[PDB]
Write a protein that binds this DNA or RNA. Structure first.
Ligand SMILES: [Mg+2]
Ligand SMILES: [Zn+2]
Lengths: 130, 55, 123, 50, 95
RNA sequence: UUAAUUGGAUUCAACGCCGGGAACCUCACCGGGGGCGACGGCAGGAUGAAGGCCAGGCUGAAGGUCUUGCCGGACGCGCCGAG
């Protein structure tokens, strides 16, 4: 219980596995996305992760495609996302494969509440507007 | 190319796929039996399209 | 088409007249291809009908291109005195080099006379 | 706007122009001299220039 | 950023203590001398001022003691907003 | 509360109302990127303006710019008024 096993297959046991034999080990949504092909932008992004995986492209990977499905290629490195105004780092670990990329870059600031004002109740609605 | 930055995209569904044939707005458009007009223009052109109000 | 600091040979005047005033009547009938580096490819093919190469251009770097391409093609041509009637012979008001136009119509006897004169003169 | 149309290798007595014609369009229009491919400039061509 | 009635020109900050009557407002500013604000006629219609409303006024170079004049009010979305910037210290309102 | 949480309507006669069941568009809102001056005159222009591309950087992605050099054949927001 220190190694990670997804469906009985270790990381480097599945790291060399294919992409059509892979999808039988993912839930519906990701199996279907892997079956209607990848979008053009995600092609352009995989063709920048693989270079950054061999020896080249030692430069921060950025993106707008929050839809990309994490895969056994991306385990280990640290890529960015775009949560609306800025690029936020997501250090990819195992136990993320299957989830969505944008799933880890939240998008609305947590809310903390002040105090009710003029109109929050029927006792301060017409007693203010004269 | 300066013709690649003022040119739109060819949608084929969603509110932005159809516009009124006479006014030019997206939104509440009539698609019954084919004619494609606003809900506002169909009301002030209908009695010339043949329609009548019986009840 | 050098600058007059290049003693190739002389310049007669009937040639100047019947090939420079022979452009207006030749522009209102056909097709003009002005400029120097515009026709170089068409004469490289051999498309030039009435090429009239100038003597106004400097420095001596892109001035001689048809004379060194002369001994490889046939080039029915003349020599040009100046530039004002050469831009104004067809088109615009800028310094012109070689209004080498294809099918100059209604102006063919001046060809039959002067093109062959400058043929049997030199090349 | 300067002046740039030259170096189409040329001397007196004979000529052998530097860059070839265009196989795509008619003859007369030249090619590139980038150093790795004859890009043909406008029509698209990457023969890894000879 | 934000458009707030900062001191522009020679403006003053009016935080009132009591309405003696007929429009006179005794104000308690960080300056010290008892100033007595009065009101123009453009706002006497659409707005509603009372005590505790830190607002902006304008003083007059005559005697610099009992002066001030409303030109614009403050809404509850600004009165305490103006604390974090420290543009005004609220302890000029509890002593 | 927020970078933005776009606006109009406040008794009857405002609140499943604007045919408003908004993933893109709709979109008017916050972050970023790029294009647009019919027409009269100005610096300039066939010794070649406006204007366009194989490949590579910057970039979220892009001949959008720059590297690289090819092409196209007359006009010109680099300047003023107008539209
Ligand atoms: Mg939207
Ligand atoms: Zn309509």
């Amino acid at each position: 219980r220190k190694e990670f096993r997804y469906r009985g297959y270790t990381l480097e046991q599945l790291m060399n596995m294919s992409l059509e034999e892979l999808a039988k080990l993912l839930p519906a949504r990701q199996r279907r996305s892997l079956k209607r092909g990848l979008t053009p932008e995600q092609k352009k992004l995989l063709r920048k992760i693989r270079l950054a995986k061999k020896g080249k492209y030692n430069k921060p990977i950025r993106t707008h495609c929050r839809d990309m499905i994490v895969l056994p290629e991306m385990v280990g490195l640290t890529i960015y996302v775009h949560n609306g105004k800025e690029f936020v780092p997501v250090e990819i670990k195992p136990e993320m494969i299957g989830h969505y990329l944008g799933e880890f870059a939240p998008t609305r600031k947590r809310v903390q509440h002040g105090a009710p004002g003029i109109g929050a109740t029927r006792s301060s609605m017409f007693v203010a507007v004269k | 190319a300066k013709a690649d930055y003022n040119k739109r995209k060819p949608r084929k569904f969603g509110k932005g796929a159809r516009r009124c044939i006479r006014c030019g707005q997206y939104g509440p458009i009539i698609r019954i039996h084919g004619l494609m007009l606003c809900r506002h223009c169909f009301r002030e052109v209908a009695p010339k399209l043949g329609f009548r109000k019986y009840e | 088409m050098a600058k007059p600091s290049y003693v190739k040979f002389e310049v007669p005047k009937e040639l100047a007249e019947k090939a420079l005033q022979a452009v207006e009547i030749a522009r209102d009938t056909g097709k003009i291809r002005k400029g120097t580096n515009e026709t170089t490819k068409a004469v490289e093919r051999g498309q030039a009908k009435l090429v009239i190469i100038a003597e106004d251009v400097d420095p001596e770097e892109i001035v001689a291109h048809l004379p060194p391409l002369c001994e490889e093609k046939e080039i029915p041509y003349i020599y040009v005195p100046s530039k004002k009637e050469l831009g104004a012979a067809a088109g615009i008001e800028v310094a012109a080099a070689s209004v080498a136009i294809i099918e100059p119509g209604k102006a063919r006897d001046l060809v039959e006379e002067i093109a062959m004169k400058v043929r049997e003169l030199m090349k | 706007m300067g002046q740039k149309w030259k170096l189409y290798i040329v001397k007196d007595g004979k000529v052998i122009r530097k860059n070839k014609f265009c196989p795509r369009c008619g003859p007369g229009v030249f090619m590139a001299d980038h150093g790795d491919r004859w890009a043909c400039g406008r029509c698209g061509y990457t023969e890894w220039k000879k | 950023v934000i458009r707030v009635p900062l001191p522009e020109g020679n403006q003053l900050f009016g935080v009132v203590e009591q309405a003696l009557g007929a429009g006179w407002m005794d104000v308690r500013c960080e300056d010290g001398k008892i100033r007595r604000c009065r009101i123009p006629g453009k706002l006497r219609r659409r707005v509603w001022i009372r005590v505790g409303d830190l607002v902006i006024v304008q003083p007059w170079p005559v005697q610099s003691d009992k002066r001030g004049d409303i030109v614009y009010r403050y809404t509850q979305t600004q009165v305490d907003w103006l604390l974090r910037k420290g543009k005004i210290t609220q302890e000029f309102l509890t002593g």
